[PDB]
Design a protein around this nucleic acid. Sequence first.
DNA 1: CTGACAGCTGCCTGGAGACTAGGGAGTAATCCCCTTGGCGGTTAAAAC
DNA 2: GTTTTAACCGCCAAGGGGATTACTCCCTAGTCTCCAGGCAGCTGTCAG
Lengths: 81, 96, 90, 104, 96, 48, 95, 92, 48
Amino acid sequence: LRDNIQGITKPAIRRLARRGGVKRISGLIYEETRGVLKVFLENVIRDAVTYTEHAKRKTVTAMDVVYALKRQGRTLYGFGG
Amino acid sequence: HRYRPGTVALREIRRYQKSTELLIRKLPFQRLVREIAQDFKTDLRFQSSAVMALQEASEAYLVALFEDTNLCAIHAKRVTIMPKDIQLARRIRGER
Amino acid sequence: TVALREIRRYQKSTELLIRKLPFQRLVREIAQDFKTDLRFQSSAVMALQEASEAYLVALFEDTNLCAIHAKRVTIMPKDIQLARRIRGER
Amino acid sequence: AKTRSSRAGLQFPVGRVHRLLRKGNYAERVGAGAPVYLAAVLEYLTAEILELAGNAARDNKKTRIIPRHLQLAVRNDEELNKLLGRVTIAQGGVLPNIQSVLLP
Amino acid sequence: KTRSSRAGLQFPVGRVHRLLRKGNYAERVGAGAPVYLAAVLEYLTAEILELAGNAARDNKKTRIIPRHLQLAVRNDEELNKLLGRVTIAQGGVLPN
Amino acid sequence: CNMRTQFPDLRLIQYDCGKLQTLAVLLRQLKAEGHRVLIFTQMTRMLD
Amino acid sequence: KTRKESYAIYVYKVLKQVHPDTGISSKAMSIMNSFVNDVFERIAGEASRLAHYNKRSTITSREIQTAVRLLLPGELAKHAVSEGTKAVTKYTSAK
Amino acid sequence: RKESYAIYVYKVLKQVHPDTGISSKAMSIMNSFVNDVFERIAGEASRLAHYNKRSTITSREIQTAVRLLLPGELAKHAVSEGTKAVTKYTSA
Amino acid sequence: VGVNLTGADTVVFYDSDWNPTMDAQAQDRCHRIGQTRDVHIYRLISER
DNA sequence: CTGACAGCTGCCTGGAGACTAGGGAGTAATCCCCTTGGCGGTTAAAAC
DNA sequence: GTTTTAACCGCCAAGGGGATTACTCCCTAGTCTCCAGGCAGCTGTCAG
């Protein structure tokens, strides 16, 4: 597993922008969005991994991700708790 | 026939705002999540529900950031979104 | 020239920029609607003034950033509106 | 034997709320009327959000509430939007909102 | 023999234990939890106090004032992140 | 060139795997009798 | 095979009280359960903090009323307080 | 009687800066900061215990709360300090 | 299944598949109707 | 003049000392549910 | 509009975790008792 950040695809970012109401997109937006998503995922995953390690488990459950998002201030519904 | 610029963009804006489906393929996101997690701790298993929750949260965050970026672009009398717009939105949001 | 000197002078200082009596009058006028014959400790009013000045300074910083993003030096009310809209207090 | 929810006239369980309050480590003691009040408030909030969700579902020619209907209800109501400002609803989408300047 | 002295710390392990017990955090508090919490608090206090003292030395002063604490907090990135949403009375803001 | 760089003999390929030895013997005998042989393997690196 | 307490039946009862004809999906029911749990956690934590501030060892109807006033916006808080006080009065009358 | 961290903050300051004093307003700031971080860590520990269905707060809960709350270098240094303190406490 | 390699007359399996139907299909790639010579199958296996 | 450190006072409370009930380790043991290196198609989202 | 390729789907396999439920059982808190020290706070004193 290496250089997986390119999996965030240019049409995917365009679709997300269109859902966000963006009409025209510059060519340099995609790298910035990739970096932002990388940072956000890093933070959430670090918190979730800490939660799982506390429970003496090795499988990251959806409850741990929900708790991590709630701690970050981004409480998510529909995945328990 | 060729639609004038901006019409198809608005049409897909309406299409993607009508729906609620996830816009990022599941396998690339799962790979990215495993790649990010392998740095913090090796031999970690992700449940499918956890990955789906991560994808939903990430898509919601990116949609909100794109809304803020478009608001920044309308400010200063523009239509295109530029990296400076994202940077301004993030800086006002309190990140970095 | 004078603006930069004033910026530096107020940046090095720590004293409260808003006058105490007008802010107390405004706080009491606002509190009059929620409850009648309300008493305020002096420390409470000082805390309110500190919080209000910090909030206003932070908002002005965000609006100056918004104005700079608009290739302008002057801050305009649209900058305040966008700063509050992006921050989420709207 | 008569349940406390029946006595209070509510639908939410007073006994379950009392157990959760006791086991949640909120205080040494829990009052008798606290679970009743909390159940009433929870029932009212559920009623409001479900009324708006059902209105959205009827507006969408659908009988069952889906998460999109709940998201539309929450975001269209200003008070519920403020209450659930930092909350993301799974499979909820976003409100249809295209800025005026972008329109042709 | 003092429990704080036994643990080799300066913060009141006993007071932290009493606060954890009287607080409604859990129905049981272990022996090592107050010691660990006191150690963490002591470390954070030592860090912020060292930074404030360095700032005070940079200002040719001998007493720590709230301005020195504000400068120390805002200059250190980690402490700025920890206290990001915190306003210090009579602390001012960083030079700009 | 021979004094500047040395490459392993292609003979060493067969010497490191018994299968290749037996396959060489069998293939040469099959060609001697005048047949055509199809070799099937599950790995493409093995095909290389 | 173990009990998992949930507000599914109560949310369904409230839905039938409000809309006798409309229905709800499993994901929507999970979202509603999460919302109820979140509001419960918010109100309970606010009440616990209120009790701690006033050096009180109990959670009463006053604490939850103040928590609802602090959390919910204007009209929502007012109507919620009306409903809660009606419920508590009826409960006291029923003994 | 009112309890405060002024004595312990003064002792820590004297340990780190023997010749440096602290003003009363700064001491109040320090007390508020200590109470805030204490409450945050304790609340995270309580939530961790409740999530894992444990009736006891142990050193593991405090360590995990510290790792969750404090940023990287601060978190690792605090974890090392807490582990050292616990090791010294248990060996007596 | 569109391959008609009836010119060959010998098949050697470098390694064996876990599914014998696959090996049978490979054999039938040459052993089908329209082939006029005896077909031989050779399988190589490593001892121990 | 004026905040801050210190010597001293009075007191609440944390340090010893005992039982001990149970919350939290050991120990099966069941079962689901994968798990991943190498392969071969097959388009429809990507890419240009 | 025209061309690339990668989700992804299906084999192919042997076992391998590793959450769970249930049993037992025993260190370690909790509660109680008693007593002396850490501490809140007071004013005196002193540098700024």
